[PDB]
Design brief:
heterotrimer; A: little secondary structure; B: SH3 type barrels; seven-stranded antiparallel β-sheet; 32% strand; PemK-like (chain C); endonuclease (chain C); transcription regulation (chain C); toxin-antitoxin system (chain C)
């Protein structure tokens, strides 16, 4: 599978 | 102005560095509103026929169900593109259920 | 050499340097070089999606609403240990709530 990326973690995202 | 809050089933547009992507919202309103966060799966217009793809039928895309991600929707400026049909949500869930269990 | 392949329930270490609980099956992780994970932290802040990881010496907490697909083979992943079956169930059970997966 191709891994989707959200870039830099934002707010309460711990990673 | 009062902000749009993602709800279960909503198809949304979300922003990252560096690009914008549609996603399907899996978590319920209460949670999403309280935390400014939600669970969702990413969508694309490219259907390659992977086992965990779910067809999203619009006028004339695929949701990747194994690609679940927690996102801070509030901070990423999520906007509402539309809503999935209940059968399509049922299905994404059904596949996620596979990778995991219950 | 044969690389370590995460199996459901394993506790791994992944860099970006964080621990995670692997929720997805071995056949999947091995085929796709990815897995569904939940991140682990040192201090439990009291949130309702926390699940304590009980160590023989000290404890840790899995954040269950923070499910994320991670490319283990790519980000590198090493095995710290395995979680107790009931630790694995509770994490899933909490996910099952945030979703409703059937």
């Amino acid at each position: 599978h191709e891994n989707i990326d959200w870039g830099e973690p934002k707010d309460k995202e711990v990673w | 102005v009062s902000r749009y809050v993602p709800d279960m089933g909503d198809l949304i547009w979300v922003d990252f560095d560096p690009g914008h992507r549609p996603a399907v919202v899996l978590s319920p309103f209460m949670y999403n509103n309280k935390t400014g966060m939600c669970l969702c799966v990413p969508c694309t217009t490219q259907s390659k026929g992977y086992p965990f793809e779910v067809v999203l039928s619009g006028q004339e895309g695929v949701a990747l169900a194994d690609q679940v991600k927690s996102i801070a929707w509030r901070a990423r400026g999520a906007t509402k593109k539309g809503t999935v049909a209940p059968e399509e949500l049922q299905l994404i869930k059904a596949k996620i259920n596979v990778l995991i269990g219950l």
